[PDB]
Structures are given as C-alpha cells and as structure tokens.
Scaffold this active site. Structure first.
Site, PDB file in Angstrom:
ATOM      1  N   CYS A 192      64.832  70.438 -92.455  1.00 49.56           N
ATOM      2  CA  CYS A 192      65.555  69.621 -91.484  1.00 49.56           C
ATOM      3  C   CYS A 192      66.314  68.477 -92.149  1.00 49.56           C
ATOM      4  O   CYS A 192      65.720  67.590 -92.767  1.00 49.56           O
ATOM      5  CB  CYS A 192      64.589  69.054 -90.424  1.00 49.56           C
ATOM      6  SG  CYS A 192      65.394  67.959 -89.225  1.00 49.56           S
ATOM      7  N   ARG A 204      65.908  64.363 -90.568  1.00 49.28           N
ATOM      8  CA  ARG A 204      64.647  63.618 -90.555  1.00 49.28           C
ATOM      9  C   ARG A 204      64.705  62.098 -90.654  1.00 49.28           C
ATOM     10  O   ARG A 204      63.668  61.440 -90.563  1.00 49.28           O
ATOM     11  CB  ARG A 204      63.710  64.123 -91.639  1.00 49.28           C
ATOM     12  CG  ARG A 204      62.886  65.314 -91.222  1.00 49.28           C
ATOM     13  CD  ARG A 204      62.106  65.838 -92.404  1.00 49.28           C
ATOM     14  NE  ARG A 204      62.970  66.490 -93.387  1.00 49.28           N
ATOM     15  CZ  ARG A 204      62.637  66.671 -94.661  1.00 49.28           C
ATOM     16  NH1 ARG A 204      61.464  66.240 -95.099  1.00 49.28           N
ATOM     17  NH2 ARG A 204      63.465  67.297 -95.490  1.00 49.28           N
ATOM     18  N   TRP A 217      69.755  66.774 -81.718  1.00 47.12           N
ATOM     19  CA  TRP A 217      71.176  66.960 -81.452  1.00 47.12           C
ATOM     20  C   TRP A 217      71.837  67.721 -82.592  1.00 47.12           C
ATOM     21  O   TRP A 217      71.291  67.805 -83.692  1.00 47.12           O
ATOM     22  CB  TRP A 217      71.876  65.624 -81.191  1.00 47.12           C
ATOM     23  CG  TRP A 217      71.674  64.592 -82.256  1.00 47.12           C
ATOM     24  CD1 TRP A 217      72.309  64.527 -83.469  1.00 47.12           C
ATOM     25  CD2 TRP A 217      70.807  63.452 -82.197  1.00 47.12           C
ATOM     26  NE1 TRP A 217      71.875  63.426 -84.167  1.00 47.12           N
ATOM     27  CE2 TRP A 217      70.954  62.751 -83.407  1.00 47.12           C
ATOM     28  CE3 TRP A 217      69.910  62.965 -81.241  1.00 47.12           C
ATOM     29  CZ2 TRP A 217      70.240  61.587 -83.687  1.00 47.12           C
ATOM     30  CZ3 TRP A 217      69.201  61.803 -81.521  1.00 47.12           C
ATOM     31  CH2 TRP A 217      69.373  61.126 -82.729  1.00 47.12           C
ATOM     32  N   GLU A 261      76.434  73.957 -87.399  1.00 48.47           N
ATOM     33  CA  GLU A 261      75.553  74.937 -86.774  1.00 48.47           C
ATOM     34  C   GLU A 261      76.352  75.804 -85.827  1.00 48.47           C
ATOM     35  O   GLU A 261      76.226  77.028 -85.823  1.00 48.47           O
ATOM     36  CB  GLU A 261      74.446  74.229 -85.995  1.00 48.47           C
ATOM     37  CG  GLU A 261      73.751  73.164 -86.786  1.00 48.47           C
ATOM     38  CD  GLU A 261      72.424  72.745 -86.176  1.00 48.47           C
ATOM     39  OE1 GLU A 261      71.609  73.636 -85.843  1.00 48.47           O
ATOM     40  OE2 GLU A 261      72.189  71.523 -86.055  1.00 48.47           O
TER      41      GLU A 261
HETATM   42  C1  HEM Z   1      67.560  64.368 -84.186  1.00 46.75           C
HETATM   43  C2  HEM Z   1      68.550  65.022 -84.805  1.00 46.75           C
HETATM   44  C3  HEM Z   1      68.318  66.319 -85.618  1.00 46.75           C
HETATM   45  C4  HEM Z   1      69.235  66.856 -86.420  1.00 46.75           C
HETATM   46  C5  HEM Z   1      70.644  66.283 -86.687  1.00 46.75           C
HETATM   47  C6  HEM Z   1      68.685  68.062 -87.007  1.00 46.75           C
HETATM   48  C7  HEM Z   1      69.314  68.903 -87.903  1.00 46.75           C
HETATM   49  C8  HEM Z   1      68.802  70.128 -88.273  1.00 46.75           C
HETATM   50  C9  HEM Z   1      69.545  71.277 -88.754  1.00 46.75           C
HETATM   51  C10 HEM Z   1      71.070  71.360 -88.958  1.00 46.75           C
HETATM   52  C11 HEM Z   1      68.679  72.252 -89.010  1.00 46.75           C
HETATM   53  C12 HEM Z   1      69.057  73.659 -89.512  1.00 46.75           C
HETATM   54  C13 HEM Z   1      69.109  74.501 -88.233  1.00 46.75           C
HETATM   55  C14 HEM Z   1      69.323  75.978 -88.478  1.00 46.75           C
HETATM   56  O1  HEM Z   1      69.979  76.331 -89.492  1.00 46.75           O
HETATM   57  O2  HEM Z   1      68.852  76.802 -87.641  1.00 46.75           O
HETATM   58  C15 HEM Z   1      67.344  71.770 -88.689  1.00 46.75           C
HETATM   59  C16 HEM Z   1      66.159  72.469 -88.815  1.00 46.75           C
HETATM   60  C17 HEM Z   1      64.896  72.088 -88.399  1.00 46.75           C
HETATM   61  N1  HEM Z   1      64.551  70.910 -87.726  1.00 46.75           N
HETATM   62 FE1  HEM Z   1      65.912  69.316 -87.406  1.00 46.75          FE
HETATM   63  N2  HEM Z   1      67.400  68.219 -86.520  1.00 46.75           N
HETATM   64  C18 HEM Z   1      67.135  67.168 -85.655  1.00 46.75           C
HETATM   65  C19 HEM Z   1      65.956  67.001 -84.956  1.00 46.75           C
HETATM   66  C20 HEM Z   1      64.741  67.629 -85.158  1.00 46.75           C
HETATM   67  C21 HEM Z   1      63.515  67.401 -84.397  1.00 46.75           C
HETATM   68  C22 HEM Z   1      63.414  66.416 -83.214  1.00 46.75           C
HETATM   69  C23 HEM Z   1      62.560  68.203 -84.903  1.00 46.75           C
HETATM   70  C24 HEM Z   1      61.069  68.385 -84.522  1.00 46.75           C
HETATM   71  C25 HEM Z   1      60.392  67.587 -83.691  1.00 46.75           C
HETATM   72  C26 HEM Z   1      63.155  68.939 -86.000  1.00 46.75           C
HETATM   73  C27 HEM Z   1      62.516  69.854 -86.791  1.00 46.75           C
HETATM   74  C28 HEM Z   1      63.178  70.872 -87.456  1.00 46.75           C
HETATM   75  C29 HEM Z   1      62.554  72.078 -87.969  1.00 46.75           C
HETATM   76  C30 HEM Z   1      61.072  72.507 -87.923  1.00 46.75           C
HETATM   77  C31 HEM Z   1      63.688  72.872 -88.593  1.00 46.75           C
HETATM   78  C32 HEM Z   1      63.520  74.242 -89.260  1.00 46.75           C
HETATM   79  C33 HEM Z   1      63.986  75.265 -88.234  1.00 46.75           C
HETATM   80  C34 HEM Z   1      63.629  76.636 -88.712  1.00 46.75           C
HETATM   81  O3  HEM Z   1      62.693  76.734 -89.556  1.00 46.75           O
HETATM   82  O4  HEM Z   1      64.288  77.607 -88.248  1.00 46.75           O
HETATM   83  N3  HEM Z   1      64.478  68.575 -86.124  1.00 46.75           N
HETATM   84  N4  HEM Z   1      67.466  70.468 -88.251  1.00 46.75           N
HETATM   85  C1  LIG Z   2      65.682  70.793 -83.301  1.00 53.97           C
HETATM   86  C2  LIG Z   2      66.999  71.383 -83.782  1.00 53.97           C
HETATM   87  C3  LIG Z   2      68.027  70.536 -84.148  1.00 53.97           C
HETATM   88  C4  LIG Z   2      69.243  71.041 -84.567  1.00 53.97           C
HETATM   89  N1  LIG Z   2      70.232  70.175 -84.897  1.00 53.97           N
HETATM   90  N2  LIG Z   2      69.433  72.373 -84.643  1.00 53.97           N
HETATM   91  C5  LIG Z   2      68.446  73.227 -84.308  1.00 53.97           C
HETATM   92  C6  LIG Z   2      68.692  74.714 -84.364  1.00 53.97           C
HETATM   93  C7  LIG Z   2      68.883  75.000 -82.878  1.00 53.97           C
HETATM   94  C8  LIG Z   2      69.420  76.352 -82.467  1.00 53.97           C
HETATM   95  C9  LIG Z   2      69.989  76.457 -81.202  1.00 53.97           C
HETATM   96  N3  LIG Z   2      70.479  77.617 -80.764  1.00 53.97           N
HETATM   97  C10 LIG Z   2      70.433  78.705 -81.539  1.00 53.97           C
HETATM   98  C11 LIG Z   2      69.872  78.663 -82.808  1.00 53.97           C
HETATM   99  C12 LIG Z   2      69.848  79.927 -83.634  1.00 53.97           C
HETATM  100  C13 LIG Z   2      69.270  79.740 -85.035  1.00 53.97           C
HETATM  101  C14 LIG Z   2      69.421  81.069 -85.775  1.00 53.97           C
HETATM  102  N4  LIG Z   2      68.612  81.115 -87.000  1.00 53.97           N
HETATM  103  C15 LIG Z   2      67.186  80.938 -86.682  1.00 53.97           C
HETATM  104  C16 LIG Z   2      68.814  82.420 -87.648  1.00 53.97           C
HETATM  105  C17 LIG Z   2      69.354  77.468 -83.290  1.00 53.97           C
HETATM  106  C18 LIG Z   2      67.212  72.752 -83.860  1.00 53.97           C
END
Ligand code: HEM
Ligand SMILES: Cc1cc(N)nc(CCc2cncc(CCCN(C)C)c2)c1
Ligand code: HEM
Ligand SMILES: Cc1cc(N)nc(CCc2cncc(CCCN(C)C)c2)c1
Ligand SMILES: C[C@H](O)[C@H](O)[C@H]1CNc2nc(N)[nH]c(=O)c2N1
Ligand SMILES: C[C@H](O)[C@H](O)[C@H]1CNc2nc(N)[nH]c(=O)c2N1
Ligand SMILES: [Zn+2]
Lengths: 413, 409
Positions: B108, B111, B280, B285
C-alpha cells in the site's frame, strides 16, 4: 526446496513450471523472513574450492554438446584436475570460453534482451599483457560491434584472475560515457553520474574539453599495474543527435547520445575462474536513454526544459506535465536512432520478445531466471507484457557479477 | 543484523532494525526470490502465544508494558482461550490492530494516512441483512459526498471455518462483466465470472457497460444473499478531458470509492474473514490498470483513434501517448467533481516521507517495490529509486480463498 515452482501471467492466465531453480548456485540476498528483491547490490579461490566448481561447469558443457560421460568428457575432466593440482588453476579451451560467455548472458536475470543470447561474438583477449594491448582489443570490439550502425553483440575477455594482485580491469564502468564536471557554484556540466570518474581521469592527466558531451578516455589496467589513459578514436564512437518528428524545436536542445551500450565494470565467472575485465555490448532499448539518462534528476534532468518548450501547465503535478514530456522525449530518441539507421529497440518490442524468450526457456530448459524490478521498463510499465508476468529470480553460473570499484582497491605502484 | 536501504537519487541511507521483529515467511529463500509472485506460498495451543505477543505490543505501544492492566489482560485471554478455544478483543485492541494491519501493509502506497482510520465494529452482526446495513453505513460514511474518509468495517471473527462471515464481492463497488454471444465482453471482463454467479442467484442485470454489481453477503457460514446498494450511496465520476472535448463522448465513468472486501484481517491469532476497508483512489488504478489493461476495459486503441495517432509501429509510442491523456482526464474529472483522488507523483512523494517517518520512529517500514511503484512513469517518481525491504509484520491483511471454491451450500 520444492522441485517444481509455478509462475503465472495475470494478463493471459498462462502458467509456467520451473525446475531450473534447482540448479541455483548463488545467494540472492533474500531469506525466508525478508525479501531483498529491490536492493541494487545485495584473495582468490583455493585448490579445494576450485575442483568442484570446475567439474560442475565441465559436466554442464559436455551436457550441452551431447557428450556427457563420453571419453572426451572424462579426459577433459582429468586434464583440468591434473592442472588445478599442479598450478592451483586451469585454462578454459576456446570452445568452453565461448559457451561460458554465452551462458553468463543467458543467466543474466536483469537483462531483458536475452532472446539474443546465443548470437554473441566472443573475442578471446587472454593473450593480452599490456594496457596498450587492451586498448587495441577494445577499439576492435567497438568498431566490430558498432558496425556502422548495425550493431552486433560482442564480448571481449581479458586474462583471468590469478593471485589477486595482477588483475586486469577496465576502470570505466561503461566503454563509452560522457564526462561530468562539478562547478565551484555547485552546478554540474555534463553527466552528473560521472563526476567522480571524470575527476580521476583529470588527475591521471586527461585534459578535459569541459563540454556537455565529452567522451571519457579509457582507463585501462593490465596485470595489476597502475591504469593508463587512452583516447578512443572519435571515428570509432558512433553518436546520434536527438530530434523530434513533430517538434522542430527539439533539435535546438543540443542533445545527442552514443550508439553503443557496453558494460566494462563486471566480472565474468566461468567454472570458478574469474575474468575481471570482460567488457560486453549489445544495443540500446529506447527507455534507457529517453527515461534514465535524460530524465532522472541526478542525470541530464531535461524534463523541466522540455516541458517549457511544450507550453505545458507545470504548477499542478496532476496536470501530468512530467509524464507528457517523457513520452515525447522517448519518441524523439527512437526517431533519431531509426532515422540514422542505428539499431535500437523500443520498450514494447523488447518486452514482447522477452516473453516469447522466457516461454521458450521454460519449454526447453525448465526455467528462466528474471529480475522483475529490472525487466520492467522505467516508463509505461503495465502496458508491457512483462509487468503482468510472474518471475522467479535465482543466480545461475556462469554469471556476470559485480565487483568493487578498482579505484577503491588498487594498490598504487 | 541491521540492514541499510539506499535511495539512488538522493543517496539517503536508512537503517532497518524493524525486520528482526517479524516471524511470518515471505516465501523467498536464500536461493530463490519470489518478490514478483502475487500470491506466494487455529488451536488453543497455537492461538495463545500469538495472542500473548499482540497484547504485549499493544501495552508496549501505549507505554504500560508490565502494568497490572497488562498482566490481567494476559491472564484474562489465557482463561478464555482455555474455555472457549478462542477469545474476544477489547475495542481499543481492535482499533489498534486495524490501524496497524494497515501500517504493516507492504503493498500500500497510501500508508502515510495509517492512523487516520475510522473503525466500525460489526462483531455483533449475525445475518446477511445485518452485514448489508453495516456495509451501507460504511459506504455512506467513507464516501462523505466526495470528501472521502478511510474506513474499515469488521465482522465477527472466524471460529470453526464452517460458520464464516464473507463478503463475496472482491470489492464493495465494481462493474458487471457480460460474456457476449459474438465472444466480445460487455462491462468489466475481470468480473465476468462473478457477474454471472449474481445472475445465477437472482440478479436481474441491466446488461450495460457500467452496471454496479449487487452485494453478495454470507453470514455465519450460510448461503450468501443478494442486496443492491442504494444508488444514492454510490458516487460516480464521468470522465472528461480538459483539452479534448471528444473525450466525454467515450462514455466513460468510474466509481469514486475503492473498497477491498475480499481479504482477511488477522490480529492476535484471530481471523477476521470479513473486513471491508476503503480509502481513496490513486489516479493510475483507474486510468492505467482498469482502463488500459488488455484484460480489462482496454480503451487504449479507441482513444488512440481520437488523438489521430499513427498506430502502425509500436516505436511511435502511441500507446504511451494515449495512456498519459487518459490519466489526465481521470485526475481532471475527480478534481472537477471535488471527489478525493491522488496523482501518482504526490502519492509516491507522500510514501517516501512516510518511510522517513517510519524509519525515524519505528526502525523500518516493510514495502513491496513491485506494488509501490506506479504502473506508469515509474522512474520519474521518487519510489523507483528507493530501495525497499519487504517482510511480514503482524497484525496484517492476508489473502484468502474465493468463497465460491470452499463453501458448502
Ligand atoms: C487512504 C488512501 C489510500 C490510498 C491512496 C491507497 C493506495 C493503494 C494502492 C494504489 C494500492 C494498490 C491497489 C491495487 O493495485 O489493487 C493499495 C493496496 C493496498 N492497500 Fe492502500 N490505499 C489507501 C488506503 C488503504 C486503507 C484504508 C487500507 C486498510 C485499512 C489499505 C490497505 C491496503 C492493502 C491491504 C493493499 C494490498 C491490496 C492487495 O493485496 O490486493 N489501504 N493501496
Ligand atoms: C483500500 C484501497 C485503496 C485504493 N486506493 N485502491 C484499492 C484497490 C481497490 C479496487 C477497486 N476496484 C477494483 C479493484 C481491482 C483490483 C484488481 N487486482 C486485485 C488484480 C481494486 C483499495
Ligand atoms: C543485444 C541486445 C541487448 C539488449 C536489448 C539489452 C537490454 C538490456 C537492458 C535494457 C538492461 C538494463 C540496463 C540498465 O538499466 O542499466 C540490460 C542489462 C544487462 N544486460 Fe542486456 N541487453 C543486450 C545485450 C546484452 C549482452 C550482449 C550481455 C552480456 C553478454 C548482456 C547482459 C546484461 C547484464 C549482465 C545486465 C545487468 C546490468 C547491470 O547489472 O548493471 N546484455 N540489458
Ligand atoms: C549490454 C547492455 C545492453 C543495454 N541495452 N544496456 C546496457 C547498459 C548500458 C549503459 C550505458 N551507459 C551507461 C549506463 C549506466 C547505467 C547506470 N546504472 C548501473 C545505475 C548503462 C548494457
Ligand atoms: C531501488 C531500485 O532497485 C532501483 O532504482 C532499480 C529499479 N529498477 C531498475 N531497472 C533497471 N533496468 N535499471 C535500473 O537501474 C533500475 N534501478
Ligand atoms: C507479475 C506481478 O506480480 C503483477 O503483475 C503485479 C505487479 N505489480 C502490481 N502492482 C500493483 N499496485 N497492483 C498490481 O495488481 C500489480 N500486479
Ligand atoms: Zn525476495
């Protein structure tokens, strides 16, 4: 470790099965508790250490030529043994040397161009004894590989390490680089990366033209002696002036680059023998110049100036003005190079070709080590197929390895 | 060992001590690195030391290690695992464990926000209808009329696997994918299978390009049930370009709330299998992945048309050019609609400052370079040049099986 490991391509759903990892010889830096996959960089071998390393490589060679366990295989093994025992070292046959070089490239997990691995001109310079001799051999390499713009990949191999105090080294990290000069006022003329090296050259006696694109001399070390300066004949250094197909003002930036990418700071490792000077060259992928050389902040850093001439709104970053310029710059790089018929590959073609390469290697060899962090282009990553490709990274021998900078280790005579 | 990480642009070196505190494997070994593998590979006795260590770091984080509050709590958890084979977190412990699972999320880039997390305890939930109400309030709260706010809703923990709470939707808000007769695909091809499970369950689809999928909610091991989020809750942004008046005519839109609902929140050896969290968007993305991935909406070519680009050789970088314009329009739309969004330059910039903070105060920050680096313009963002160490700290968000592969009806 498990016998078969699976990798998946998330765009095509294709799954590949790796058995080759089982042959892994060296450490990656990773442990089970921590991954160093994004860390850039994570006196001689004794008789007892050398024996098994040599045998390993010899077996593998005779396995490649389909003569494993043959009379000539056992005879070569016994000869190498006899030789390590009497002289504490041994000498590769020319066939082995060429096989070893090609495979070191084949095993280079950071190289995206490896589809071409088996087309590599190998220049045996193991008879070299002096720096003037190295300079000759290098000039020949350059002229051959340059080929008037139709680049061909080549390696030149200087004598192996012996006792550690008689190393051959190219002090230049690459055969062709531009000088960097640090002003009293703190600004930098030229390529800021090369400020330290340039300073070394100047001290050694190089008279600097103090320009933006001054080709550095070679600093060559033979047989552990102090290094010596030589100038590459400019007629041997092919260069491309950068222009843009649409923006006529682009040429007014006074930019150019050299056609031949050639690394000279790495150590080639074959059968436990260490070749400390083994300069190799291929041809450029556009992004190397257009993104890194040109747009990295501690490099030529031209994004700002280019954006200005493009009339881009540069107050918000969410205007994406940096990005828009980057694409143009990289277009102008591919266009200049193609217009001058100097071989270059764009990042789309190179990554596509690499996937086909990787797939073939899984098919024929049971794996293909790859360093995703290096393989994926530094621009437009996800729109190239490698981005979505899972990759296992492990170190196979023969290999290209890093070694300390010679000016950190040299004992000045 | 103390490990050093170097940024290769500024030459700043940071010393990582935090990694010594981890115990879960990464999947790598000395001889094989799997840093680019996306999915690398509880009894009373197992559960206790896990529980013990987490209480220990909670009372350490609040400067009362060895206090009587600490002692009693340790004894309390002991007796409860003893007599129920599990145990229940205090509310304060739940909020800490949520924030810290975020803080430990190595993938993420967002963070820097970790401690500003709204935590909704939904552990009193018992039915799908309950979950649906809890989820609607989450959605409405976090959306906040465009001024998004980070939120997580946590449902009852696992007990015996047979009575699991699960949100079947991978995310709370996604568009339906339709497999046409002629072989093309309508909507979002990535959801195609899920879309069809929903249909197979009673969902009447409008078969359009951007149809919000219904919620599929499984409570206490039961069959999942369908619920439609009320439209007024689902904020959406129409994508237009600032210079290209024709861009609006592409008919593109996206939802403003990204909310992962398929993961598992783990705290003190307890398994929160249903824990949707939202934040957000970073513009890439949507603009890069959702729109331009060949396996997704795949708009690149169509866009390249309207830009009158030469699309015969790849070396014209036409794909690149169209990509940058798509991402400009996305950022521009959200911003024009006062919907929260961050561009990848600011986001990555923020992440670097966050890393500094974590090293300064915490002795490290686990980070997965493969995920942190944006899918476009990689090396013109600060994090491309930042060495990062990845390792697994607990509490954490882990992946889990898709429910339609393990649930018995
Ligand atoms: C608040 C603004 C936030 C931004 C700008 C942000 C940004 C991102 C982005 C760009 C990704 C990659 C997403 C993808 O490629 O699917 C990601 C992944 C992730 N985020 Fe954040 N995020 C935010 C909030 C959060 C929150 C609130 C949580 C948990 C309480 C969180 C936990 C995670 C986790 C666990 C992943 C890994 C997702 C996965 O393994 O597929 N994030 N984040
Ligand atoms: C907490 C959180 C924050 C953020 N900025 N983006 C995400 C990913 C959200 C998300 C929304 N619609 C669709 C997807 C598809 C992800 C596809 N990957 C897993 C292959 C992911 C999650
Ligand atoms: C023939 C065309 C070739 C292409 C298109 C190509 C492409 C590339 C690229 C883009 C990189 C990343 C460079 C960087 O960012 O510094 C690279 C690295 C590398 N290549 Fe290739 N290359 C070619 C030839 C070769 C040859 C001939 C060899 C060896 C015999 C080789 C071995 C390596 C090695 C060892 C690296 C790692 C560089 C390092 O660690 O600094 N390549 N290559
Ligand atoms: C064989 C080969 C092929 C290729 N396409 N690129 C290379 C690297 C080319 C290259 C040329 N000048 C300078 C550099 C400096 C790279 C700096 N990195 C190490 C931080 C690299 C080597
Ligand atoms: C920190 C990180 O490892 C470093 O910036 C890497 C990223 N990937 C790279 N990839 C290539 N091809 N060349 C590089 O110099 C780098 N630099
Ligand atoms: C092969 C690779 O692991 C896979 O494509 C990853 C790469 N990095 C990513 N990074 C982010 N943020 N999101 C992703 O889905 C992926 N996919
Ligand atoms: Zn690793």
């Amino acid at each position: 470790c498990p016998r078969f490991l699976k990798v998946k391509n998330w765009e095509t759903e294709v799954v590949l099965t790796d058995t080759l990892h089982l042959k892994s010889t060296l450490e990656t830096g990773c442990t089970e508790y921590i991954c160093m996959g994004s860390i850039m960089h994570p006196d001689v071998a004794t008789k007892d250490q050398l024996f098994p390393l040599a045998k390993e490589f010899i077996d593998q060679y005779y396995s490649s030529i389909k003569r494993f366990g043959s009379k000539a295989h056992m005879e070569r093994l016994e000869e190498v043994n006899k030789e390590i025992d009497t002289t504490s070292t041994y000498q590769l046959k020319d066939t082995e040397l060429i096989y070893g070089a090609k495979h070191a490239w084949r095993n280079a997990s950071r190289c995206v161009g490896r589809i071409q691995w088996s087309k590599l001109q190998v220049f045996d310079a193991r008879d070299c004894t002096t720096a003037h001799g190295m300079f000759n051999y290098i000039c020949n390499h350059v002229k051959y590989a340059t080929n008037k713009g139709n680049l061909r990949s080549a390696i030149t191999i200087f004598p192996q390490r012996t006792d550690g105090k008689h190393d051959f080294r190219v002090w230049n990290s690459q055969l062709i680089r531009y000088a960097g000069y640090k002003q009293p006022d703190g600004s930098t003329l030229g390529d800021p990366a090369n400020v330290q090296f340039t300073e070394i050259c100047i001290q050694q006696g190089w008279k600097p033209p103090r320009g933006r694109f001054d080709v550095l001399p070679l600093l060559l070390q033979a047989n552990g002696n102090d290094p010596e300066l030589f100038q590459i004949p400019p007629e041997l250094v092919l260069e491309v002036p950068i222009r843009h197909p649409k923006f006529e003002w682009f040429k007014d930036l006074g930019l150019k680059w050299y056609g031949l990418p050639a690394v000279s700071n790495m150590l080639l490792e074959i059968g436990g023998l260490e070749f400390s000077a083994c300069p190799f060259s291929g041809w450029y992928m556009g992004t190397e110049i257009g993104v890194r050389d040109y747009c990295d902040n501690s490099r030529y850093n031209i994004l700002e100036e280019v954006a200005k001439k493009m009339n881009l709104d540069m107050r918000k970053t969410s205007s994406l003005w940096k990005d828009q310029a980057l694409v143009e710059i990289n277009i102008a790089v591919l266009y200049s190079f193609q217009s001058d018929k100097v071989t270059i590959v764009d990042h789309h073609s190179a990554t596509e070709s690499f996937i086909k390469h990787m797939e073939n290697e899984y098919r024929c060899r049971g794996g293909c080590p790859a360093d995703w962090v290096w393989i994926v282009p530094p621009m437009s990553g996800s729109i190239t197929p490698v981005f979505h490709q899972e990759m296992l990274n492990y170190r196979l021998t023969p290999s290209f390895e890093y070694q300390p900078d010679p000016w950190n280790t040299h004992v000045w005579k």
